[PDB]
Ligand binder design. Sequence first.
Ligand SMILES: Cc1ncc(C[n+]2csc(CCOP(=O)(O)OP(=O)(O)O)c2C)c(N)n1
Ligand SMILES: Cc1ncc(C[n+]2csc(CCOP(=O)(O)OP(=O)(O)O)c2C)c(N)n1
Ligand SMILES: Cc1ncc(C[n+]2csc(CCOP(=O)(O)OP(=O)(O)O)c2C)c(N)n1
Lengths: 554, 554, 555
Amino acid sequence: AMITGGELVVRTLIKAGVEHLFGLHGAHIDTIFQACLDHDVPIIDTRHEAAAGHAAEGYARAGAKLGVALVTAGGGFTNAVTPIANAWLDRTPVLFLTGSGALRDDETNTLQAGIDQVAMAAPITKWAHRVMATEHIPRLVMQAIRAALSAPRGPVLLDLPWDILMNQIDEDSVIIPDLVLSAHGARPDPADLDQALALLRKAERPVIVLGSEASRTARKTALSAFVAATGVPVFADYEGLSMLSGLPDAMRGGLVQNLYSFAKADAAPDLVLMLGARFGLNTGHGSGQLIPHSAQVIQVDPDACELGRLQGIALGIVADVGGTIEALAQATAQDAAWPDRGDWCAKVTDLAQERYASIAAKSSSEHALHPFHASQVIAKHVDAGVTVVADGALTYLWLSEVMSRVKPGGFLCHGYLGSMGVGFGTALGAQVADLEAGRRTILVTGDGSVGYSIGEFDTLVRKQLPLIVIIMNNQSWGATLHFQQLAVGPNRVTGTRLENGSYHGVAAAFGADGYHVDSVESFSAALAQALAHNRPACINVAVALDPIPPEELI
Amino acid sequence: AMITGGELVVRTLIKAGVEHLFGLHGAHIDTIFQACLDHDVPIIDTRHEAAAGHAAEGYARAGAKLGVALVTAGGGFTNAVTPIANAWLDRTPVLFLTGSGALRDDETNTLQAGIDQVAMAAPITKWAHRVMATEHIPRLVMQAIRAALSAPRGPVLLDLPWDILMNQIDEDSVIIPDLVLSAHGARPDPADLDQALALLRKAERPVIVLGSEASRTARKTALSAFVAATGVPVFADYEGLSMLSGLPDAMRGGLVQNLYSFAKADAAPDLVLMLGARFGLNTGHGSGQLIPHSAQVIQVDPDACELGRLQGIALGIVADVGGTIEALAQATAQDAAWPDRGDWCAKVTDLAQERYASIAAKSSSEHALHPFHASQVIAKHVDAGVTVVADGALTYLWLSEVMSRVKPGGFLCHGYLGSMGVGFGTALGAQVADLEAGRRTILVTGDGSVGYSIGEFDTLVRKQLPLIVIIMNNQSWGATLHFQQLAVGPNRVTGTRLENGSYHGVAAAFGADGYHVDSVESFSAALAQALAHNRPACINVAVALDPIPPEELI
Amino acid sequence: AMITGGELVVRTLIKAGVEHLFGLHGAHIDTIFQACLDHDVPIIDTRHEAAAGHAAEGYARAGAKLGVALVTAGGGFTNAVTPIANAWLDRTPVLFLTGSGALRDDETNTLQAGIDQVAMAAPITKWAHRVMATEHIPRLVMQAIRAALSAPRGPVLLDLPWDILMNQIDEDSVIIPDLVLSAHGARPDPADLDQALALLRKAERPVIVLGSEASRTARKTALSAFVAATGVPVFADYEGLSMLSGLPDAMRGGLVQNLYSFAKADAAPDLVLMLGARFGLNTGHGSGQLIPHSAQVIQVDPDACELGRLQGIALGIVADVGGTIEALAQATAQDAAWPDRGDWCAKVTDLAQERYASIAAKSSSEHALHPFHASQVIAKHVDAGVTVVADGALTYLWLSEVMSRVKPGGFLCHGYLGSMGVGFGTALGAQVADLEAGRRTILVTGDGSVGYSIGEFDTLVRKQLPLIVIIMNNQSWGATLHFQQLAVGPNRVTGTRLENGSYHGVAAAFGADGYHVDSVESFSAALAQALAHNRPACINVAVALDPIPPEELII
Ligand SMILES: Cc1ncc(C[n+]2csc(CCOP(=O)(O)OP(=O)(O)O)c2C)c(N)n1
Ligand SMILES: Cc1ncc(C[n+]2csc(CCOP(=O)(O)OP(=O)(O)O)c2C)c(N)n1
Ligand SMILES: Cc1ncc(C[n+]2csc(CCOP(=O)(O)OP(=O)(O)O)c2C)c(N)n1
């Protein structure tokens, strides 16, 4: 009945409800591997701690739950920092467990010791802390979990010294707490809710914009009730998109980028209800290009700093986005009637169709496969049964154009960090989450980005994870090459070409199914075949580089 | 119409509703002084930045509003770090504005430059940031204010480089935003509130315990309604104490320390509703000595990490404490009649009286004025018209014993930092806030502690702030001297005696009224006279050192 | 005559003498790419910022010069953190140039912004700083270089906001400073030098142990003179090893690990002169197993905190190691003849031979190629014309056993960070530095470790860098699997097997020459052929997992 600190870690994780970890082995953290082995808790071990970190993010994002990453001292930790930073800006709930030097061997210039891992993580975590006593493990693990899961969600680092984990203590001398933290988020004051609803009622052209916090709490039933009662069209940033999948067509505004053309059509929203969507990269900053300067804005966010960050707002509410959605659905259920918004919804629909049609008209695959056409081939397969993860740059910009009319089970794109290459790990973790949900994961990445984590084909094969990796291959770091041509000059391309390498050949050498395609017909065939089998796959798609996606042209 | 960065700062503060600043002049921040002069906004300039920072804290705490501290580059900032740390652990909303080296003169080994002020403040602030452009000033000032005022309240550092402040910009090119942040805090989900009230109704011996977040939002009307509807007795840590002042005697449990004697009297609460009271120093940590292990605990806090930090809880709600109190009042205004709690309330009263009488029985001023007797002299004058600020150590431990019986308008004691000396600046700021409240501030401090900021008698006189400073003088750093005697040995006193100096003489040399007293009669007379006139005063009170306050043992 | 901040960066690097950068493109740093293009300064662009950072390290280490890494905002920077940490612990002079968010767009929740990159680098750099004005670029780049190159060498982070780099200023409005920093480091006070030499003279069994700072300054001629005058045997940690390559065999003690068997031989050194070798992982910590507790220790290091960190010393000197070697050479060029130390040098030689022979006697390739035998195949090709880079774990522990008797041009192994995977980028950078020297780079890595940076086969092919990557393949994360079996139990292997994948196939799919081998004969043939051509290669070597290397046995 003596147990290790690592055993305490795992017992606390199990009690919290954790069922998977992502990681890479080291002696420093072996006690956690041994405890997981004993308790039949899978640790999905990758070929790089970065991929493990991103997998924990992908698992969290796809499954709307806590992701758990597990890395060893020193380079284990430093290899996980891009995931930490990505989860930080994305508001993704990930518990990063890292080993560190033994406290008893402090300042001995020893193996993997001497990196101030807590200091390195401090700027990019909700909380980061080094455990000082084995007996503290359960309470501090649970504290870390509460930090990560609470609004706004985000990453936490718990640093566990080798001696602290190896230490044995009497199991009856320490209690393993429950996770006692309400599942229901805090909601607005009724006066604020009444004011928001009065504004929503009076608007001529109201819209809702969902952000990541909407996705984390995933109150889709309540969202549907609210949206059905009010008839208000709903848009979302990338992270919020999959929250629109259960909504009636007339109310699906799609990606918030679609608001761009509304002003020119004399149709700019006069009221915007932002639910966890920040003023920033995905919402046009303070430009007024998507969220009009002439609109009254009601913003709901758990972080007061965000409220009107870049633009004057009418009503700033600090509350949980999920809780607020519940409250709005509760309020509008008591309502006899809401203004008819058929005409406005139709306008929203028509404007989306006009964008899509315009792109379709301009796109030609006469000489090489057009990125828009390649994106459409994927779109035909996207529904509730699929999670789409997007990496690259031009690649996701083109892909985004087909994403609003489909209803993905999940959609995981770059956030503010825009870190090329994070998608592979992200998609691998998403696929683990998706297994329980009966979903198939498709990664859509660029030829540049896939190189970051290309070893993970080995992991797919060892773990029999049926991730489909589609590489949009334009023989370049594409968006950066576009930048050079457009911002500097046509003869100023340097350091951005990638005219080498058979990626499907690399996949095949790792035991995954490899395909190379270069047309709508060949791509359609390959994708259909890949989807028909429960096997990991790489589809290398030769695509044109020259086309400029609308988001880039903007 | 060209205006300075400093003018932008002050326009934004005014628009936010700021009416006072505390600080100490430097050239680096002169543009802010000049703008305040133009706009008739007082800056209360102290003799030490630490006193200024603590004054901003006291103003925030006594006034339930934002405090603003203003300090210059380098030593101005480093002199403010004890206030920042105190505000951090006390959850006190203070905006610290600091000057810093000019960006254009970066890395020139120049005057007051080269201190990474934001890095130093990062571990002890909700947000710390250095402004990069004059045009960003209004949006970042307002962002900082939203960070400080949001639940849980806390300090923010906004660092304003000299060139950023001196730069002039067209006033028409930058908008000064409003403070658009709901005054109403987020509330619990009704399911959680229902469960909490169901538990409260079934309990045989329920208690409520208030913490600092309750004092920050000051929802007194709602608290009264809730308490009258349920008949449940209410306790508080030091920071929540003044929130009990408007309650009927039967439901005033007073300081949470009074729960100590309940288990031995077979009267331990079976339910504890913690409203912003954390598990920690003031609540008995996880010992169960105040919050029984056998009790079911409902905990409400804006920080999920705090929920069941040191002890298992039954229900953990993340919400604003003020919003929650409003929600509870609203719910209990509409539900059935609540069970009578007269007998339990009388038990609470009797146990408090038994404690007070026991101390009274033991306390003798035969040979020297006893600290309990001195405390009673003060208590005679405490009501809504008074703010009591407490510093020293033995001094506040004795004072705490008389505080539950009285109903102070404000009570500001040490929090977790326990930093001797913070009281003087705190009380000076409190007196400023108390002007518009029609309150008189009394600082009760130790002879050791008063030395930290003794030059502030000058500030009281220059600004005509009628603070009464009562020095409980036991010619020692008292609690520390007791530590040496009790934990080490009677012959082991070293570095703790202070058998020198006429504090009243020091005050008089700064132009404040000085008194030296040594008995109940002489002390009563001096305090009565000091209270009769709106003049700053120092009352140097000779008190016994040997008596051990109940809390010291515990 | 208006030029960008990025042009100022590049003009300053050029004036300092930088001839290569390693990096990965981003728009945030394009102005630096464009300026390098104009000036014909190569940027070796990799498939991961980590590989670019490790390449800059390898270039610095192999080249004994400044390495420069160039990365974009946000994820560009965060992907470079492992290189920064590695350089930090290894005392390697690398200037990490990173983009960051524009100052004018501060706090706008925009692309790649919002990471406090300086705060993240602070605990693992000599200096980290974000540039506040375009006019400050030349003086702060040069200041950064002076920080990296000064003793003890280490990594510096210079963070260059996008607007600061794109901003254009009059090229004549700012001076580009020269690099004015003495090449000759500070030396000991003569009293301290005299005391050290008096102890060295009186000692019965003196040894010298070199550390990384000896490699950075590479005072080979002075070292040769000093060692010839005194006849004292010289050992080194991994990073100091190539500094022994120009010494006579008699005075080459080799890797400091060899000191382990000396006490049982009644031959423990009575004096140890530590020249930038710290007390720590490579020197036996404070255990006295290599540096005896009974020895008088003279320690010379540019960081006073290192001096007797873990063990009492007799004389603690803060000075540059190169400057100290020059001082020692100067002193011993004008003093009395030194005691003959032939018998002691012979004992050193005998004990090394006993270790090697013992390993050889125990090693069998009957059923699978033994790691010691695979290591011997490599050693046959190691001389001044070769840089050996070592990664993996059991892989380098075995490799270490053959490295003392050969004289490598370069030897770059794991330092204190022990970060599996850093070797590929390191070797790629080393191969760039080795070009001008006519040296060939060989990476000896594990099947586990190679996976970290395997996309760099692409870079080798795109840049025609003839790096030979040797994968010691035991189908596992080997040392960690041994840990599980030895420290936990034979039935407790979890998360450590890697029984999948054709690494030579991966290399081939990137266009590199691939070989798969499983015997002394096959491996010898593949290596000979790969060395005969100036082509990148991958040699996948099937080796046994079960053998325990002496360094693990000791542990
Ligand atoms: C970690 C990281 N490194 C560099 C960049 C700079 N960058 C932006 S887009 C881009 C090109 C991505 O190329 P690819 O993955 O092939 O997608 P494509 O644009 O060609 O579709 C690069 C290198 C970045 N955003 N993140
Ligand atoms: C800034 C700071 N310095 C030192 C201490 C240690 N300390 C705790 S109690 C105490 C004695 C305070 O003496 P006094 O203010 O005269 O109050 P007394 O206990 O005598 O009533 C000291 C020095 C502290 N808590 N904070
Ligand atoms: C970045 C990093 N991750 C994990 C570890 C833990 N670790 C130590 S040795 C080892 C095995 C290395 O395997 P391989 O590269 O194949 O070399 P081998 O020991 O099998 O020769 C691992 C994973 C580490 N030291 N660094």
